[PDB]
Amino acid sequence: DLNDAQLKFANDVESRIQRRIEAILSPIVGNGNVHAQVTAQLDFANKEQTEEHYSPNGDASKATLRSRQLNISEQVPRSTQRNETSNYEVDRTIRHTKMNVGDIERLSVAVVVNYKTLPLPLTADQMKQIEDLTREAMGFSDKRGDTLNVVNSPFS
Amino acid sequence: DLNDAQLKFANDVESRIQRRIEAILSPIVGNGNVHAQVTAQLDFANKEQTEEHYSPNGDASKATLRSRQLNISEQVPRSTQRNETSNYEVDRTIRHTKMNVGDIERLSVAVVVNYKTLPLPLTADQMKQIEDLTREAMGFSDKRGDTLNVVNSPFS
Amino acid sequence: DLNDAQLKFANDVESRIQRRIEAILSPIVGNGNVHAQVTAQLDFANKEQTEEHYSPNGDASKATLRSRQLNISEQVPRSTQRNETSNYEVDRTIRHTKMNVGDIERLSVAVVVNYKTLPLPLTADQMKQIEDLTREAMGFSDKRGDTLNVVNSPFS
Amino acid sequence: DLNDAQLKFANDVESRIQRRIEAILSPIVGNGNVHAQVTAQLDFANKEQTEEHYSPNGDASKATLRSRQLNISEQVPRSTQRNETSNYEVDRTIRHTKMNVGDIERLSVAVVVNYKTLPLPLTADQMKQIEDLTREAMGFSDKRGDTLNVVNSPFS
């Protein structure tokens, strides 16, 4: 029963993205001269993370001391001694996070644009504008790994 | 059921932003000569953080002492001794934070502007003013990573 | 009873992918001039993972110390001694994940395209566009190992 | 009673594969000019696995230390001493998996293609296309060890 819920959730996400793309693209080319299909991958795994960090204190001008002992001796046959003990206080940061189930991982979008009749193919600048608008509509992210493909061809 | 609530919340946020953009842009170009689409990414993860910091006390003019012992000896064959023990009091700061679920992470906005009929394209200065107004309306933030694209093209 | 549920889930996934491919391809070649078949492999195993990592502290400028003892002696027959003891604080990260049952592992898709009658085979550019659109529709992933095969042949 | 369930499950899997192959192959050669038979081997054993791994720390630039003692002496008859004790923190990964009962291990498929009447045997290119489509339909995997055999012969 959970798998069916996952399928319906994915379908809802894809339908919302497709509706947004159609809404933004309709005023330019026409009401029924564009079609789009969206496929999405979703993460349904449970993840938790805990991170702990400390700041370096190797520099004497940055360390914080709590107690220190220092003994120095010298006899002049030359003899020299030096004993040192130190205790430090350190800066510590802890973060705990629990990830959300149902996030998007990757998107792939294909768009088909009808020819203009006044059978003449669209110009390159119009195709570039259409691609830019579609990229904005999909929330394109290079880090995620999304793919987009737009094809201009006459409709049957 | 939670995922549907997340979807409706995202839709509400996007609709509010779109309504604001349309409201600010309508008086300049016209009532029905502009369209906008907004897509948003939201963070639905639970995060907590604790930070602890100390101030450095390596400078003798900044340290705070609680007790100190100092023994010095000298015999004149030259002999010299020096024993020192010190205890410090330090300044400490602690901060605890719990993040809010449902914050915005990134925004992408696409706007289409109709041609002016008195078929003449709009001037560059008008496009710059429109872009500035849209940037103000979206709450543009360079740190967040928002993207905006405005296209001037005749409407079908 | 579980195996029948797995079979029906796989059939639903394949049917959804086939429907998407047919929907994207229909406007270009025609309503009834394309057929597609999809077979999918699904992972129905239960997996859990725990990962723990530490940051290196071999560099003296990156380590965080809690206490340190250092004794140095020298008599001048030349004698030299040096005793050192140190205690460190380290950065540690822990992650726990539980995988989702029912994920896709591999996809194989076969498409047949009808000849154009105005018996003339389709051009190479049209075949390339069809292949690109199908690749977008299937959510093709090279890492997963998907396979696609498109054949242009007259229909009986 | 379990063995009968295993037999019916295997029959269902084989019937689904045969139906897919017939559906993809019918539009090209004809409605009743192709037959296929599928036999499958299934794994009905219960298996569990646990894996544990550690990262190497032989490089001094990658190790993480918790405490270290180092004593050095030298008298100049030349005498030299060096005592060292070290304690490490290591990265550890644990994975636990439980396999799914009822997976496919190997497939064998035989197909017979009828002669074309306009008694003329089919061309080599058509046979290659049929083989490629069948390979896509069966989800052929070289690692699994599947076998396919297609024969073109007149029907009685």
C120 CA: distance to closest CA in chain D (Å):
16
* Cα B75 to Cα B81: distance, rounded to the nearest angstrom: 9
Query: Which chains lie within 8 Å of chain C at 3 or more CB pairs, if any?
Result: A, D
Measured distance CA(B152)–CA(B145) in Å, rounded: 24
Which of D22, D24, D117 has the highest number of chain C CBs within 10 A, making it the mutation to test binding with C?
D24
Taking CA atoms, what residue in A is nearest to C132? A149
Instruction: Kindly tell me the sign of the dihedral angle through the C-alpha atoms of C32, C114, D147, D98.
Output: negative
Secondary structure string (H, E, C) spanning chain A: CHHHHHHHHHHHHHHHHHHHHHHHHHHHHCCCCEEEEEEEEEECCEEEEEEEEECCCCCCCCCEEEEEEEEEEEECCCEEEEEEEEEEECCEEEEEEECCCCEEEEEEEEEEECCECCCECCCHHHHHHHHHHHHHHHCCCCCCCCEEEEEECCCC
Token look-up 């004149």 returns B76
Residues of chain D immediately before an interruption (C to N > 2.5 Å): 76, 118
A137 touches chain B (CB under 8 A): yes
* Nearest Cα to Cα of residue A111 among A149, A155, A71: A149
Strands (E), D79-131: 79-89, 92-98, 103-113
For residue B136, what is the DSSP state? H
From chain C, the residues in CB contact with A55 under 8 A are 64
Distance between CA atoms of A7 and C20, rounded to whole angstroms? 14
DSSP state of D33: S
Q: Kind and range of the H or E element at B37?
A: strand B34-43
As to burial, measured by CB atoms within 10 angstroms (0-12 exposed, 13-18 middle, 19+ buried), residue D134 is buried
Q: How many CB atoms lie within 10 A of CB A41?
A: 17
Spatial separation of the C-alpha atoms in residues B130 and B124, rounded to whole Å: 10
If you measure CA to CA, which chain B residue comes closest to A98? B46
Residues of D in contact with C47 (CB under 8 A): 95-97
**For residue D71, what are the contacts with CB-CB under 8 A and spacing of at least 6?**
C82, C83, C84, D81, D82, D83, D84
Place of tokens 């010190």: B86
Helix (H, G, I), strand (E, B), or coil: what is residue D23? helix
**DSSP H/E element including D67:** strand D64-75
Å between C4 CA and nearest CA of chain A: 13
DSSP of B47-100, one letter per residue?
EEEEEEEE----STTT-EEEEEEEEEEEE---EEEEEEEEEEE--EEEEEEEPP
Instruction: Give, for D48, the enclosing helix (H) or strand (E).
Output: strand D48-54
C102/A6 touch (CB, cutoff 8 Å), yes or no? yes
Q: CB-based contact (8 Å) between A88 and chain C?
A: yes
Three state DSSP letters for chain C = CHHHHHHHHHHHHHHHHHHHHHHHHHHHHCCCCEEEEEEEEEECCEEEEEEEEECCCCCCCCCEEEEEEEEEEEECCCEEEEEEEEEEECCEEEEEEECCCCEEEEEEEEEEECCECCCECCCHHHHHHHHHHHHHHHCCCCCCCCEEEEEECCCC
Touching status, chains D and A (3+ beta-carbon pairs under 8 Å): no
The span from the first CA to the last CA of chain C, in angstroms, equals: 40
Cβ-contact C4, C11 below 8 angstroms: no
Confirm if A96 and A52 have CB atoms less than 8 A apart: no
